[PDB]
């Protein structure tokens, strides 16, 4: 589990969105596994605006933050999970690291701010849904 709290927005994995998220929806995209809802309180996270390929992510199944190198956001075939059939996921970045289903929502960050959230896992890989192109999160 986990979210990004920037401005009056809450960014979560679409597959983990709650009824309150869907009842206060700003934007959602199944192909990216992302959903954004509105919040009453202002958040403290800041979004990175860059093309970094190194950063640090939080892994809840290890209670640890790991430094990783990751690929640029791309269209990748992701195997079936409990939440999606095997399909192409867009704006996804991969790194070598540990990721179990419940690790979704952990933040990946670089020197400029939050880069994305954990979205995929298995086989010693971790995949992150990028948010750096969503410029509207800043206003
Ligand atoms: C990059 C890639 C291709 N095929 C896959 C694996 N697909 S999945 O990540 O949707 C599987 C899911 C159960 C999960 C496991 C662990 C963590 C977060 C989700 O990943
Ligand atoms: Zn950066």
């Amino acid at each position: 589990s986990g979210a990004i709290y920037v401005g009056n927005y809450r960014v979560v994995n679409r597959h983990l969105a709650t009824h309150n998220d869907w009842a206060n929806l700003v934007w959602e995209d199944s192909s990216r596994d992302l959903l954004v809802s509105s919040t009453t309180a202002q958040g403290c996270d800041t979004i990175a605006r860059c093309d970094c390929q190194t950063g640090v992510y939080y892994c809840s199944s290890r209670r640890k933050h790991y430094p990783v190198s990751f690929s640029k956001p791309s269209l990748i075939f992701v195997e079936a999970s409990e939440y999606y059939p095997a399909r192409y996921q867009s704006h996804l970045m991969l790194a070598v690291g540990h990721s179990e289903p419940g690790d979704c929502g952990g933040i990946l960050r670089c020197q400029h701010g939050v880069v994305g959230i954990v979205s995929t896992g298995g086989n010693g890989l971790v995949g992150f849904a990028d948010v750096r192109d969503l410029l509207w999160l800043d206003e």
Side-chain angles (χ1 to χ4, degrees), residues 7-90:
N8 288 270
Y9 297 121
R10 165 174 144 94
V11 187
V12 286
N13 293 92
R14 187 186 186 274
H15 73 273
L16 299 180
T18 67
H19 163 74
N20 185 72
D21 290 320
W22 279 109
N24 291 280
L25 182 65
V26 172
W27 170 85
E28 54 83 26
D29 183 320
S30 173
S31 77
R32 294 178 69 151
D33 185 42
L34 285 181
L35 181 147
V36 178
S37 59
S38 62
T39 65
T40 59
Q42 293 180 279
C44 297
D45 295 318
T46 290
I47 313 296
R49 305 294 180 195
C50 72
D51 205 11
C52 287
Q53 288 186 255
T54 66
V56 174
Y57 84 106
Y58 183 63
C59 177
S60 71
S61 68
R62 298 285 180 267
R63 289 194 187 102
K64 279 195 182 56
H65 295 258
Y66 292 102
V68 285
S69 299
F70 54 95
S71 60
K72 295 195 183 197
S74 309
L75 185 67
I76 309 190
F77 200 66
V78 179
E79 294 303 318
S81 68
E82 301 156 81
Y83 301 94
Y84 297 110
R87 57 90 151 86
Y88 280 96
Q89 181 159 323
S90 63

Coordinates of all heavy atoms in Angstrom, one line a residue, residues 7-90:
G7 N 0.1 18.6 -3.2 CA -1.0 19.6 -3.3 C -2.2 19.0 -2.6 O -2.2 18.4 -1.6
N8 N -3.4 19.2 -3.4 CA -4.7 18.6 -2.9 C -5.0 17.3 -3.8 O -6.1 17.0 -4.0 CB -5.8 19.5 -2.9 CG -5.7 20.5 -1.8 OD1 -6.2 20.3 -0.7 ND2 -5.1 21.6 -2.0
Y9 N -3.9 16.5 -4.0 CA -4.1 15.3 -4.8 C -3.5 14.1 -4.0 O -2.5 14.2 -3.3 CB -3.3 15.3 -6.1 CG -3.8 16.4 -7.1 CD1 -3.0 17.4 -7.5 CD2 -5.2 16.4 -7.5 CE1 -3.5 18.4 -8.4 CE2 -5.7 17.4 -8.3 CZ -4.8 18.4 -8.8 OH -5.3 19.3 -9.7
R10 N -4.1 12.9 -4.2 CA -3.6 11.7 -3.6 C -3.5 10.7 -4.8 O -4.4 10.5 -5.6 CB -4.7 11.1 -2.7 CG -4.5 9.6 -2.3 CD -5.5 9.2 -1.2 NE -6.0 7.8 -1.4 CZ -5.5 6.7 -0.8 NH1 -4.4 6.8 0.0 NH2 -6.0 5.5 -1.1
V11 N -2.2 10.3 -5.0 CA -1.9 9.4 -6.2 C -1.7 8.0 -5.7 O -0.8 7.8 -4.8 CB -0.6 9.9 -6.9 CG1 -0.4 9.0 -8.2 CG2 -0.6 11.4 -7.2
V12 N -2.5 7.1 -6.2 CA -2.5 5.7 -5.7 C -2.5 4.7 -6.9 O -2.8 5.1 -8.0 CB -3.7 5.3 -4.8 CG1 -3.5 5.9 -3.5 CG2 -5.0 5.6 -5.6
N13 N -2.1 3.5 -6.7 CA -2.3 2.4 -7.7 C -3.8 2.3 -8.0 O -4.6 2.2 -7.0 CB -1.8 1.1 -7.2 CG -0.3 1.0 -6.9 OD1 0.1 1.3 -5.8 ND2 0.5 0.7 -8.0
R14 N -4.2 2.3 -9.3 CA -5.6 2.2 -9.6 C -6.2 1.0 -9.0 O -7.3 1.0 -8.5 CB -5.8 2.2 -11.1 CG -7.3 2.3 -11.6 CD -7.4 2.1 -13.1 NE -8.7 2.4 -13.6 CZ -9.6 1.4 -13.7 NH1 -9.4 0.2 -13.2 NH2 -10.8 1.6 -14.3
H15 N -5.4 -0.2 -8.9 CA -6.0 -1.4 -8.4 C -6.2 -1.4 -6.9 O -6.9 -2.4 -6.4 CB -5.2 -2.6 -8.9 CG -3.8 -2.8 -8.3 ND1 -2.7 -2.2 -8.8 CD2 -3.5 -3.6 -7.2 CE1 -1.7 -2.7 -8.0 NE2 -2.1 -3.5 -7.1
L16 N -5.6 -0.5 -6.2 CA -5.8 -0.3 -4.7 C -6.7 0.8 -4.3 O -6.8 1.1 -3.1 CB -4.4 -0.2 -4.1 CG -3.5 -1.5 -4.3 CD1 -2.2 -1.3 -3.6 CD2 -4.2 -2.8 -3.7
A17 N -7.3 1.6 -5.3 CA -8.1 2.7 -5.0 C -9.3 2.3 -4.2 O -9.9 1.2 -4.4 CB -8.6 3.4 -6.3
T18 N -9.7 3.2 -3.2 CA -10.8 2.9 -2.3 C -12.1 3.5 -2.9 O -12.1 4.3 -3.8 CB -10.5 3.5 -0.9 OG1 -10.5 5.0 -1.1 CG2 -9.2 3.1 -0.3
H19 N -13.3 3.2 -2.2 CA -14.5 3.8 -2.6 C -14.4 5.3 -2.5 O -14.9 6.0 -3.4 CB -15.7 3.3 -1.8 CG -17.0 4.2 -1.9 ND1 -17.8 4.2 -3.0 CD2 -17.4 5.2 -1.1 CE1 -18.8 5.1 -2.8 NE2 -18.5 5.8 -1.7
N20 N -13.7 5.8 -1.4 CA -13.6 7.3 -1.3 C -12.8 7.9 -2.4 O -13.1 9.0 -2.9 CB -13.0 7.7 0.1 CG -13.0 9.2 0.3 OD1 -14.1 9.8 0.5 ND2 -11.8 9.8 0.1
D21 N -11.7 7.2 -2.9 CA -11.0 7.6 -4.0 C -11.9 7.8 -5.3 O -11.8 8.8 -6.0 CB -9.8 6.7 -4.4 CG -8.7 6.7 -3.4 OD1 -8.4 7.8 -2.9 OD2 -8.1 5.6 -3.1
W22 N -12.7 6.7 -5.6 CA -13.5 6.7 -6.8 C -14.6 7.8 -6.6 O -15.0 8.4 -7.6 CB -14.2 5.3 -6.9 CG -13.3 4.4 -7.6 CD1 -12.6 3.3 -7.0 CD2 -12.9 4.3 -9.0 NE1 -11.9 2.6 -8.0 CE2 -12.0 3.2 -9.2 CE3 -13.3 5.1 -10.1 CZ2 -11.5 2.9 -10.5 CZ3 -12.7 4.8 -11.3 CH2 -11.9 3.7 -11.5
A23 N -15.1 8.1 -5.4 CA -16.1 9.1 -5.2 C -15.6 10.6 -5.2 O -16.3 11.5 -5.3 CB -16.8 8.9 -3.8
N24 N -14.2 10.7 -5.2 CA -13.6 12.0 -5.3 C -12.5 12.0 -6.4 O -11.4 12.5 -6.3 CB -12.9 12.4 -3.9 CG -13.9 12.6 -2.9 OD1 -14.5 13.7 -2.8 ND2 -14.3 11.5 -2.1
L25 N -12.9 11.4 -7.5 CA -11.9 11.1 -8.6 C -11.5 12.3 -9.4 O -12.4 13.2 -9.7 CB -12.6 10.1 -9.6 CG -11.7 9.7 -10.7 CD1 -10.5 8.9 -10.2 CD2 -12.6 8.8 -11.7
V26 N -10.2 12.5 -9.6 CA -9.7 13.5 -10.5 C -9.4 12.9 -11.9 O -9.7 13.5 -12.9 CB -8.5 14.2 -9.9 CG1 -7.8 15.2 -10.9 CG2 -8.9 14.9 -8.5
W27 N -8.6 11.8 -11.9 CA -8.1 11.2 -13.1 C -7.8 9.7 -12.9 O -7.3 9.4 -11.8 CB -6.9 12.0 -13.7 CG -6.2 11.3 -14.8 CD1 -6.4 11.4 -16.1 CD2 -4.9 10.6 -14.7 NE1 -5.5 10.7 -16.9 CE2 -4.6 10.2 -16.0 CE3 -4.2 10.1 -13.6 CZ2 -3.4 9.5 -16.3 CZ3 -3.0 9.5 -13.9 CH2 -2.6 9.1 -15.2
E28 N -8.0 8.8 -13.9 CA -7.6 7.4 -13.7 C -7.2 6.9 -15.1 O -7.8 7.3 -16.1 CB -8.6 6.6 -13.1 CG -10.0 6.6 -13.7 CD -10.2 5.7 -14.9 OE1 -9.5 4.6 -15.0 OE2 -11.1 6.0 -15.8
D29 N -6.2 6.0 -15.1 CA -5.8 5.3 -16.3 C -5.4 3.9 -16.0 O -4.3 3.6 -15.4 CB -4.6 6.2 -16.9 CG -4.1 5.7 -18.3 OD1 -4.0 4.5 -18.4 OD2 -3.7 6.5 -19.1
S30 N -6.2 3.0 -16.5 CA -5.9 1.5 -16.3 C -4.6 1.1 -16.9 O -3.9 0.3 -16.3 CB -7.1 0.7 -16.9 OG -6.9 -0.7 -16.8
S31 N -4.3 1.6 -18.1 CA -3.1 1.2 -18.8 C -1.8 1.5 -18.0 O -0.8 0.9 -18.2 CB -3.0 1.7 -20.2 OG -2.6 3.1 -20.3
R32 N -1.9 2.5 -17.1 CA -0.8 3.0 -16.3 C -0.9 2.5 -14.9 O 0.1 2.7 -14.1 CB -0.7 4.5 -16.3 CG -0.4 5.1 -17.6 CD -0.4 6.7 -17.6 NE 0.7 7.2 -16.8 CZ 1.3 8.3 -17.1 NH1 0.9 9.1 -18.0 NH2 2.4 8.7 -16.3
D33 N -2.0 1.8 -14.5 CA -2.2 1.5 -13.1 C -2.2 2.7 -12.1 O -1.8 2.6 -11.0 CB -1.3 0.3 -12.6 CG -1.6 -0.1 -11.2 OD1 -2.9 -0.3 -10.9 OD2 -0.7 -0.5 -10.4
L34 N -2.8 3.8 -12.6 CA -2.8 5.0 -11.7 C -4.2 5.6 -11.5 O -5.0 5.6 -12.5 CB -1.9 6.2 -12.4 CG -0.4 6.0 -12.3 CD1 0.3 7.2 -12.9 CD2 0.1 5.8 -10.8
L35 N -4.4 6.1 -10.4 CA -5.7 6.9 -10.1 C -5.3 8.0 -9.1 O -4.4 7.9 -8.2 CB -6.7 5.9 -9.4 CG -8.1 6.6 -9.1 CD1 -9.2 5.6 -9.2 CD2 -8.1 7.1 -7.7
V36 N -5.9 9.2 -9.4 CA -5.7 10.4 -8.6 C -7.0 10.8 -8.0 O -8.0 11.0 -8.8 CB -5.0 11.5 -9.4 CG1 -4.8 12.7 -8.5 CG2 -3.6 11.0 -9.9
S37 N -7.1 11.1 -6.7 CA -8.3 11.6 -6.1 C -8.0 12.9 -5.4 O -6.8 13.3 -5.2 CB -8.9 10.6 -5.1 OG -7.9 10.3 -4.1
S38 N -9.0 13.7 -5.0 CA -8.8 15.0 -4.4 C -8.8 14.8 -2.8 O -9.4 13.9 -2.3 CB -9.9 16.0 -4.8 OG -11.2 15.4 -4.4
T39 N -8.0 15.7 -2.2 CA -7.9 15.6 -0.7 C -8.3 17.0 -0.1 O -8.2 18.0 -0.7 CB -6.4 15.4 -0.3 OG1 -5.6 16.5 -0.7 CG2 -5.8 14.1 -0.9
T40 N -8.7 16.9 1.2 CA -9.1 18.1 1.9 C -7.8 18.8 2.4 O -7.7 20.0 2.3 CB -10.1 17.8 3.0 OG1 -9.6 16.8 3.9 CG2 -11.4 17.3 2.4
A41 N -6.8 18.0 2.9 CA -5.6 18.6 3.4 C -4.5 18.6 2.3 O -4.4 17.7 1.5 CB -5.1 17.7 4.6
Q42 N -3.6 19.6 2.4 CA -2.5 19.7 1.4 C -1.4 18.8 1.8 O -1.0 18.6 3.0 CB -1.9 21.1 1.4 CG -2.9 22.1 0.8 CD -2.3 23.5 0.8 OE1 -2.3 24.2 1.8 NE2 -1.7 23.9 -0.3
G43 N -0.8 18.1 0.9 CA 0.3 17.1 1.1 C 1.7 17.7 1.0 O 1.9 18.8 0.5
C44 N 2.7 16.9 1.4 CA 4.1 17.3 1.5 C 5.0 16.8 0.4 O 6.2 17.2 0.4 CB 4.6 17.0 2.9 SG 3.8 17.8 4.3
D45 N 4.6 15.8 -0.4 CA 5.5 15.3 -1.4 C 5.6 16.3 -2.5 O 4.7 17.0 -2.9 CB 4.9 14.0 -1.9 CG 4.9 12.9 -0.8 OD1 6.0 12.8 -0.1 OD2 3.9 12.1 -0.8
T46 N 6.8 16.3 -3.2 CA 7.1 17.1 -4.4 C 7.4 16.2 -5.5 O 8.0 15.1 -5.3 CB 8.3 18.0 -4.1 OG1 7.9 19.0 -3.1 CG2 8.8 18.6 -5.3
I47 N 6.9 16.5 -6.7 CA 7.2 15.6 -7.9 C 8.4 16.0 -8.6 O 8.7 17.2 -8.9 CB 6.0 15.6 -8.9 CG1 4.6 15.4 -8.2 CG2 6.2 14.6 -10.1 CD1 4.5 14.0 -7.5
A48 N 9.3 15.0 -9.0 CA 10.5 15.2 -9.8 C 10.1 15.6 -11.2 O 9.2 15.0 -11.8 CB 11.3 14.0 -9.8
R49 N 10.8 16.5 -11.8 CA 10.6 16.9 -13.3 C 12.0 16.7 -13.9 O 12.8 17.7 -13.9 CB 10.0 18.3 -13.4 CG 8.7 18.5 -12.6 CD 7.5 17.7 -13.1 NE 6.3 17.9 -12.3 CZ 5.2 17.1 -12.4 NH1 5.2 16.1 -13.2 NH2 4.2 17.3 -11.6
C50 N 12.3 15.5 -14.5 CA 13.7 15.1 -14.9 C 13.6 13.8 -15.7 O 12.6 13.2 -15.8 CB 14.5 14.9 -13.6 SG 14.0 13.4 -12.7
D51 N 14.8 13.3 -16.2 CA 14.9 12.0 -16.8 C 15.9 11.1 -16.0 O 16.6 10.3 -16.6 CB 15.3 12.1 -18.3 CG 14.9 10.9 -19.1 OD1 14.1 10.0 -18.5 OD2 15.3 10.7 -20.3
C52 N 16.0 11.3 -14.7 CA 16.9 10.4 -13.9 C 16.6 9.0 -14.1 O 15.4 8.6 -14.3 CB 16.7 10.7 -12.4 SG 17.4 12.3 -11.8
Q53 N 17.6 8.1 -14.0 CA 17.5 6.7 -14.1 C 18.2 6.1 -12.9 O 18.4 4.9 -12.9 CB 18.1 6.1 -15.4 CG 17.2 6.4 -16.6 CD 17.8 5.6 -17.8 OE1 18.5 6.2 -18.7 NE2 17.7 4.3 -17.8
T54 N 18.4 6.8 -11.8 CA 18.9 6.3 -10.6 C 18.0 7.0 -9.4 O 17.7 8.2 -9.6 CB 20.3 6.4 -10.3 OG1 20.6 7.8 -10.2 CG2 21.2 5.8 -11.4
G55 N 17.8 6.2 -8.4 CA 16.9 6.7 -7.3 C 16.9 5.7 -6.2 O 17.7 4.8 -6.1
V56 N 15.9 5.8 -5.3 CA 15.7 5.0 -4.1 C 14.2 4.7 -4.0 O 13.4 5.6 -4.1 CB 16.2 5.7 -2.9 CG1 16.0 5.0 -1.6 CG2 17.7 6.0 -3.0
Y57 N 13.9 3.4 -3.8 CA 12.5 3.0 -3.5 C 12.2 2.4 -2.2 O 13.1 1.7 -1.6 CB 11.9 2.2 -4.7 CG 12.1 0.7 -4.6 CD1 11.1 -0.2 -4.2 CD2 13.4 0.1 -4.9 CE1 11.4 -1.6 -4.1 CE2 13.6 -1.3 -4.8 CZ 12.6 -2.1 -4.4 OH 12.9 -3.5 -4.4
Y58 N 11.0 2.5 -1.7 CA 10.6 1.8 -0.5 C 10.0 0.5 -0.7 O 9.0 0.4 -1.5 CB 9.7 2.7 0.4 CG 9.4 2.0 1.7 CD1 10.3 1.8 2.6 CD2 8.1 1.6 2.0 CE1 10.1 1.1 3.8 CE2 7.8 0.9 3.2 CZ 8.8 0.7 4.1 OH 8.5 0.0 5.3
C59 N 10.5 -0.6 -0.1 CA 10.0 -2.0 -0.1 C 9.4 -2.4 1.2 O 10.2 -2.7 2.2 CB 11.2 -2.9 -0.6 SG 10.7 -4.6 -0.6
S60 N 8.1 -2.4 1.3 CA 7.4 -2.7 2.6 C 7.7 -4.1 3.0 O 7.8 -4.4 4.3 CB 5.9 -2.4 2.6 OG 5.2 -3.3 1.8
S61 N 7.9 -5.1 2.1 CA 8.1 -6.5 2.5 C 9.5 -6.7 2.9 O 9.8 -7.8 3.4 CB 7.8 -7.4 1.3 OG 8.7 -7.2 0.2
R62 N 10.4 -5.7 3.0 CA 11.7 -5.7 3.6 C 11.9 -4.6 4.6 O 13.0 -4.5 5.2 CB 12.8 -5.6 2.5 CG 12.8 -6.8 1.5 CD 13.4 -8.0 2.2 NE 13.5 -9.1 1.3 CZ 12.5 -10.1 1.2 NH1 11.4 -10.0 1.9 NH2 12.7 -11.1 0.4
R63 N 10.9 -3.7 4.8 CA 11.1 -2.5 5.7 C 12.4 -1.7 5.3 O 13.2 -1.4 6.2 CB 11.0 -2.8 7.2 CG 9.7 -3.1 7.6 CD 9.7 -3.0 9.1 NE 8.4 -3.5 9.6 CZ 8.2 -4.7 10.1 NH1 9.2 -5.6 10.3 NH2 7.0 -5.1 10.5
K64 N 12.7 -1.6 4.0 CA 13.9 -1.0 3.6 C 13.7 -0.2 2.4 O 12.9 -0.5 1.5 CB 14.9 -2.2 3.3 CG 15.6 -2.8 4.5 CD 16.8 -3.6 4.2 CE 17.4 -4.2 5.5 NZ 16.4 -5.0 6.3
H65 N 14.6 0.8 2.3 CA 14.7 1.6 1.1 C 16.0 1.2 0.3 O 17.1 1.0 0.9 CB 14.9 3.1 1.5 CG 13.7 3.7 2.1 ND1 12.8 4.6 1.4 CD2 13.3 3.6 3.4 CE1 11.9 5.0 2.3 NE2 12.1 4.4 3.5
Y66 N 15.8 0.9 -1.0 CA 16.9 0.4 -1.8 C 17.3 1.4 -2.9 O 16.4 1.8 -3.6 CB 16.5 -0.9 -2.5 CG 16.3 -2.1 -1.6 CD1 15.0 -2.5 -1.2 CD2 17.4 -2.8 -1.0 CE1 14.8 -3.7 -0.4 CE2 17.2 -3.9 -0.2 CZ 15.9 -4.3 0.1 OH 15.8 -5.5 0.9
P67 N 18.6 1.6 -3.1 CA 19.0 2.4 -4.3 C 19.0 1.5 -5.5 O 19.4 0.3 -5.5 CB 20.5 2.8 -3.9 CG 21.0 1.7 -3.0 CD 19.7 1.2 -2.2
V68 N 18.4 2.1 -6.6 CA 18.3 1.3 -7.9 C 18.6 2.1 -9.0 O 18.4 3.3 -9.1 CB 16.8 0.8 -8.0 CG1 16.5 -0.4 -7.1 CG2 15.8 1.9 -7.8
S69 N 19.0 1.5 -10.1 CA 19.0 2.0 -11.5 C 17.7 1.5 -12.2 O 17.4 0.3 -12.0 CB 20.2 1.5 -12.3 OG 21.4 1.9 -11.6
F70 N 17.0 2.3 -12.9 CA 15.8 1.9 -13.6 C 15.7 2.4 -15.0 O 16.4 3.4 -15.4 CB 14.6 2.4 -12.7 CG 14.6 3.9 -12.4 CD1 13.9 4.8 -13.2 CD2 15.2 4.4 -11.2 CE1 13.8 6.2 -12.9 CE2 15.2 5.8 -10.9 CZ 14.5 6.6 -11.8
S71 N 14.9 1.7 -15.8 CA 14.7 2.0 -17.2 C 13.9 3.3 -17.4 O 13.1 3.7 -16.5 CB 14.2 0.8 -18.0 OG 12.9 0.4 -17.5
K72 N 13.9 3.8 -18.6 CA 13.0 5.0 -18.9 C 11.6 4.5 -19.1 O 11.4 3.3 -19.5 CB 13.5 5.6 -20.2 CG 14.9 6.3 -20.0 CD 15.2 7.2 -21.1 CE 16.6 7.8 -20.9 NZ 16.8 9.0 -21.8
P73 N 10.6 5.3 -18.8 CA 9.2 4.9 -18.9 C 8.9 4.3 -20.3 O 9.2 5.0 -21.3 CB 8.4 6.2 -18.6 CG 9.3 7.1 -17.9 CD 10.7 6.7 -18.3
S74 N 8.3 3.1 -20.3 CA 8.0 2.4 -21.6 C 6.8 1.6 -21.5 O 6.1 1.4 -20.5 CB 9.2 1.5 -21.9 OG 10.5 2.1 -21.8
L75 N 6.4 1.0 -22.7 CA 5.3 0.1 -22.8 C 5.9 -1.3 -22.6 O 6.6 -1.8 -23.5 CB 4.7 0.3 -24.2 CG 3.4 -0.5 -24.5 CD1 2.3 0.0 -23.6 CD2 3.0 -0.4 -26.0
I76 N 5.5 -2.0 -21.6 CA 6.0 -3.4 -21.2 C 4.9 -4.4 -20.9 O 3.9 -4.1 -20.3 CB 6.9 -3.2 -19.9 CG1 7.9 -2.1 -20.0 CG2 7.4 -4.5 -19.4 CD1 8.9 -1.9 -19.0
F77 N 5.1 -5.6 -21.5 CA 4.1 -6.7 -21.2 C 4.4 -7.2 -19.8 O 5.5 -7.4 -19.3 CB 4.4 -8.0 -22.2 CG 3.2 -8.8 -22.2 CD1 2.0 -8.4 -22.8 CD2 3.2 -10.1 -21.6 CE1 0.8 -9.2 -22.8 CE2 2.1 -10.9 -21.7 CZ 0.9 -10.4 -22.3
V78 N 3.3 -7.1 -19.0 CA 3.3 -7.5 -17.6 C 2.4 -8.8 -17.5 O 1.3 -8.7 -18.0 CB 2.8 -6.4 -16.7 CG1 2.8 -6.8 -15.2 CG2 3.6 -5.1 -16.9
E79 N 2.9 -9.8 -16.8 CA 2.2 -11.0 -16.6 C 0.9 -10.8 -15.8 O 0.8 -9.8 -15.0 CB 3.0 -12.1 -16.0 CG 4.2 -12.6 -16.9 CD 3.7 -13.1 -18.3 OE1 2.7 -13.9 -18.3 OE2 4.3 -12.8 -19.3
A80 N 0.0 -11.7 -15.9 CA -1.3 -11.6 -15.2 C -1.1 -11.6 -13.7 O -0.1 -12.1 -13.1 CB -2.1 -12.9 -15.5
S81 N -1.9 -10.8 -13.0 CA -1.9 -10.7 -11.5 C -3.3 -10.9 -11.1 O -4.2 -11.2 -11.9 CB -1.4 -9.3 -11.1 OG -2.3 -8.3 -11.5
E82 N -3.6 -10.7 -9.7 CA -5.0 -10.8 -9.3 C -5.8 -9.6 -9.8 O -7.1 -9.7 -9.8 CB -5.1 -10.7 -7.7 CG -4.3 -11.8 -7.0 CD -3.9 -11.4 -5.6 OE1 -4.8 -11.5 -4.7 OE2 -2.8 -10.9 -5.4
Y83 N -5.2 -8.5 -10.3 CA -5.8 -7.3 -10.6 C -5.9 -7.0 -12.1 O -6.8 -6.2 -12.5 CB -5.1 -6.1 -9.9 CG -5.2 -6.3 -8.4 CD1 -4.1 -6.9 -7.7 CD2 -6.3 -5.9 -7.6 CE1 -4.1 -7.0 -6.4 CE2 -6.3 -6.0 -6.3 CZ -5.2 -6.6 -5.6 OH -5.2 -6.7 -4.3
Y84 N -5.0 -7.6 -12.9 CA -5.1 -7.3 -14.3 C -4.8 -8.6 -15.0 O -3.9 -9.4 -14.6 CB -4.0 -6.3 -14.8 CG -4.2 -4.9 -14.2 CD1 -3.3 -4.4 -13.2 CD2 -5.2 -4.1 -14.6 CE1 -3.4 -3.2 -12.7 CE2 -5.4 -2.8 -14.1 CZ -4.5 -2.4 -13.1 OH -4.7 -1.1 -12.5
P85 N -5.3 -8.9 -16.2 CA -4.8 -10.0 -17.0 C -3.4 -9.6 -17.6 O -3.0 -8.5 -17.4 CB -5.8 -10.0 -18.2 CG -6.3 -8.6 -18.4 CD -6.3 -8.0 -17.0
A86 N -2.7 -10.6 -18.2 CA -1.4 -10.3 -18.9 C -1.8 -9.2 -20.0 O -2.8 -9.4 -20.7 CB -0.9 -11.5 -19.5
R87 N -1.1 -8.1 -19.9 CA -1.4 -7.0 -20.8 C -0.2 -6.1 -20.9 O 0.8 -6.2 -20.1 CB -2.7 -6.3 -20.3 CG -2.6 -5.7 -18.8 CD -2.1 -4.4 -18.8 NE -2.5 -3.5 -17.7 CZ -1.9 -3.4 -16.5 NH1 -1.0 -4.3 -16.1 NH2 -2.3 -2.4 -15.7
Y88 N -0.2 -5.1 -21.8 CA 0.8 -4.1 -21.9 C 0.5 -3.0 -21.0 O -0.6 -2.5 -21.0 CB 0.9 -3.6 -23.3 CG 1.7 -4.5 -24.2 CD1 1.1 -5.5 -25.0 CD2 3.1 -4.5 -24.2 CE1 1.8 -6.3 -25.8 CE2 3.9 -5.4 -25.0 CZ 3.2 -6.3 -25.8 OH 4.0 -7.1 -26.5
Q89 N 1.5 -2.6 -20.1 CA 1.3 -1.5 -19.2 C 2.2 -0.4 -19.7 O 3.4 -0.6 -20.1 CB 1.7 -1.9 -17.8 CG 1.5 -0.8 -16.8 CD 1.4 -1.2 -15.3 OE1 0.8 -2.3 -14.9 NE2 1.9 -0.3 -14.4
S90 N 1.6 0.8 -19.8 CA 2.4 2.0 -20.3 C 3.0 2.8 -19.2 O 2.6 2.7 -18.0 CB 1.4 2.9 -21.1 OG 0.4 3.4 -20.3

